[PDB]
Design a protein around this motif. Structure first.
Motif, PDB file in Angstrom:
ATOM      1  N   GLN A   1     -15.618  -4.191  -0.039  1.00  0.00           N
ATOM      2  CA  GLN A   1     -14.821  -4.205   1.206  1.00  0.00           C
ATOM      3  C   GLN A   1     -15.443  -3.176   2.138  1.00  0.00           C
ATOM      4  O   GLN A   1     -15.961  -2.154   1.664  1.00  0.00           O
ATOM      5  CB  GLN A   1     -13.440  -3.740   0.906  1.00  0.00           C
TER       6      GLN A   1
ATOM      7  N   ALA B   1     -10.052   7.776   0.710  1.00  0.00           N
ATOM      8  CA  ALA B   1     -10.768   8.025   1.958  1.00  0.00           C
ATOM      9  C   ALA B   1     -11.977   8.950   1.648  1.00  0.00           C
ATOM     10  O   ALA B   1     -11.837   9.946   0.916  1.00  0.00           O
ATOM     11  CB  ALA B   1      -9.831   8.660   2.967  1.00  0.00           C
TER      12      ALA B   1
ATOM     13  N   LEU C   1       0.845  -1.163   0.000  1.00  0.00           N
ATOM     14  CA  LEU C   1       0.000   0.000   0.000  1.00  0.00           C
ATOM     15  C   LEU C   1       0.900   1.238   0.000  1.00  0.00           C
ATOM     16  O   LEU C   1       1.919   1.252   0.719  1.00  0.00           O
ATOM     17  CB  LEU C   1      -0.799   0.051   1.308  1.00  0.00           C
TER      18      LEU C   1
ATOM     19  N   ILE D   1      -1.015   6.667   7.710  1.00  0.00           N
ATOM     20  CA  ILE D   1      -1.910   6.310   6.618  1.00  0.00           C
ATOM     21  C   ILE D   1      -3.312   6.872   6.780  1.00  0.00           C
ATOM     22  O   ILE D   1      -4.000   7.096   5.784  1.00  0.00           O
ATOM     23  CB  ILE D   1      -1.955   4.756   6.459  1.00  0.00           C
TER      24      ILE D   1
ATOM     25  N   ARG E   1      -3.169   0.649  -3.873  1.00  0.00           N
ATOM     26  CA  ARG E   1      -2.952  -0.817  -3.527  1.00  0.00           C
ATOM     27  C   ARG E   1      -2.386  -1.554  -4.730  1.00  0.00           C
ATOM     28  O   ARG E   1      -2.922  -1.327  -5.818  1.00  0.00           O
ATOM     29  CB  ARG E   1      -4.244  -1.423  -3.090  1.00  0.00           C
TER      30      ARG E   1
ATOM     31  N   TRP F   1       2.974   0.142   3.578  1.00  0.00           N
ATOM     32  CA  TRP F   1       2.832  -1.156   4.194  1.00  0.00           C
ATOM     33  C   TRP F   1       3.082  -2.195   3.071  1.00  0.00           C
ATOM     34  O   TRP F   1       2.728  -1.954   1.910  1.00  0.00           O
ATOM     35  CB  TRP F   1       1.422  -1.292   4.783  1.00  0.00           C
TER      36      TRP F   1
ATOM     37  N   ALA G   1      -2.982  -6.931  11.218  1.00  0.00           N
ATOM     38  CA  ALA G   1      -1.998  -6.204  10.489  1.00  0.00           C
ATOM     39  C   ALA G   1      -1.680  -4.976  11.315  1.00  0.00           C
ATOM     40  O   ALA G   1      -2.595  -4.360  11.874  1.00  0.00           O
ATOM     41  CB  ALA G   1      -2.497  -5.769   9.082  1.00  0.00           C
TER      42      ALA G   1
ATOM     43  N   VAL H   1      -0.156  -1.285  10.851  1.00  0.00           N
ATOM     44  CA  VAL H   1       0.064  -0.297   9.772  1.00  0.00           C
ATOM     45  C   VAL H   1       0.440   1.062  10.345  1.00  0.00           C
ATOM     46  O   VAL H   1       0.049   1.366  11.454  1.00  0.00           O
ATOM     47  CB  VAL H   1      -1.219  -0.139   8.841  1.00  0.00           C
TER      48      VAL H   1
ATOM     49  N   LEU I   1      -7.059  -4.253  12.460  1.00  0.00           N
ATOM     50  CA  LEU I   1      -5.990  -3.288  12.171  1.00  0.00           C
ATOM     51  C   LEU I   1      -5.460  -2.680  13.509  1.00  0.00           C
ATOM     52  O   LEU I   1      -6.264  -2.363  14.354  1.00  0.00           O
ATOM     53  CB  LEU I   1      -6.426  -2.107  11.312  1.00  0.00           C
TER      54      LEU I   1
ATOM     55  N   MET J   1     -11.853  11.223  10.100  1.00  0.00           N
ATOM     56  CA  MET J   1     -11.322  10.075  10.726  1.00  0.00           C
ATOM     57  C   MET J   1     -11.191  10.328  12.252  1.00  0.00           C
ATOM     58  O   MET J   1     -10.746  11.384  12.677  1.00  0.00           O
ATOM     59  CB  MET J   1      -9.948   9.830  10.111  1.00  0.00           C
TER      60      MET J   1
ATOM     61  N   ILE K   1     -11.336  -4.779   8.679  1.00  0.00           N
ATOM     62  CA  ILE K   1     -11.687  -4.583   7.245  1.00  0.00           C
ATOM     63  C   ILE K   1     -12.132  -5.922   6.736  1.00  0.00           C
ATOM     64  O   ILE K   1     -11.364  -6.898   6.848  1.00  0.00           O
ATOM     65  CB  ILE K   1     -10.546  -4.050   6.484  1.00  0.00           C
TER      66      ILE K   1
ATOM     67  N   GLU L   1     -17.713   2.658   6.305  1.00  0.00           N
ATOM     68  CA  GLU L   1     -17.624   2.919   4.851  1.00  0.00           C
ATOM     69  C   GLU L   1     -17.389   1.719   4.035  1.00  0.00           C
ATOM     70  O   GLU L   1     -16.868   0.742   4.534  1.00  0.00           O
ATOM     71  CB  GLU L   1     -16.598   3.899   4.374  1.00  0.00           C
TER      72      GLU L   1
ATOM     73  N   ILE M   1      -7.668   3.710  -3.573  1.00  0.00           N
ATOM     74  CA  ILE M   1      -8.634   3.684  -2.534  1.00  0.00           C
ATOM     75  C   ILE M   1      -8.713   5.108  -1.959  1.00  0.00           C
ATOM     76  O   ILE M   1      -7.745   5.622  -1.386  1.00  0.00           O
ATOM     77  CB  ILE M   1      -8.220   2.702  -1.400  1.00  0.00           C
TER      78      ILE M   1
ATOM     79  N   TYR N   1      -2.842   0.486  14.475  1.00  0.00           N
ATOM     80  CA  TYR N   1      -2.223   1.659  13.889  1.00  0.00           C
ATOM     81  C   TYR N   1      -1.057   2.033  14.778  1.00  0.00           C
ATOM     82  O   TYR N   1      -1.246   2.299  15.971  1.00  0.00           O
ATOM     83  CB  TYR N   1      -3.210   2.833  13.773  1.00  0.00           C
TER      84      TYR N   1
END
Ligand SMILES: C=CC[C@H](COc1ccc(-c2nc3ccccc3n2Cc2ccccc2)cc1)n1c(-c2ccccc2)nc2ccccc21
Length: 146
Positions: free
Chosen positions: A77, A110, A21, A52, A60, A31, A46, A48, A143, A113, A125, A87, A108, A145
């Motif tokens: 997704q 956004a 990514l 991000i 991606r 990532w 994951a 990340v 995820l 946030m 996800i 989302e 992708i 962060y």
């Protein structure tokens, strides 16, 4: 059903080999991994970079192999925060040659946030892989962060 059998055959012949990514503006790699995060039935994790979450868009690169031919390989997704979908994204790859290895590039976007500290460990996800309308698998990544 011939359709359920066919779903199992595509899944059996499918592997996600690697994925990257990038910050879509930078082109910087944020990532990368070689673990097939699309395998169903286990919760993947994951780690990340938190920066991000500040990207306008992320690019991606997803490299996959498929023994089975697919007419319309696509993904739907969703990002879930404590169980609630915040989302959704739709991406289409289209035709897949049987026994091929393919790299698929996607942007992708956004769509405000919450902080990384609030989201970390609380986001899943969920990715559904289809051939046209036939659901092939559903997989989930939790995820963190960092
Ligand atoms: C530009 C928006 C940033 C990002 C966008 O979302 C995605 C980034 C990558 C994927 C993705 N494509 C996959 C294909 C096959 C299997 C799994 C896939 N995923 C999920 C994924 C991929 C790689 C690492 C972790 C999770 C799906 C969504 N995003 C992220 C995020 C950041 C880094 C990696 C993954 C998601 N967390 C978010 C929380 C709330 C709103 C958006 C969030």
């Amino acid at each position: 059903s011939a359709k359920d059998e066919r779903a199992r055959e595509i899944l059996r012949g499918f592997k996600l080999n690697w994925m990257n990514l990038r910050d879509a503006e930078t082109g910087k790699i944020l990532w990368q991994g070689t673990e097939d995060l699309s395998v169903p039935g286990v919760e993947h994790e994951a780690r990340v970079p938190k920066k991000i979450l500040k990207c306008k868009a992320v690019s991606r690169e997803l490299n996959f192999s498929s023994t089975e031919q697919m007419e319309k390989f696509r993904l739907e997704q969703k990002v879930y925060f404590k169980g609630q979908c915040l989302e959704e994204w739709f991406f289409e790859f289209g035709f897949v040659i049987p026994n091929s290895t393919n790299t698929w590039q996607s942007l992708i976007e956004a769509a405000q946030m919450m902080p990384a500290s609030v989201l970390t460990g609380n986001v899943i996800i969920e990715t559904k892989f289809f051939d046209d309308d036939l659901l092939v698998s559903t997989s989930r990544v939790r995820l963190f962060y960092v």
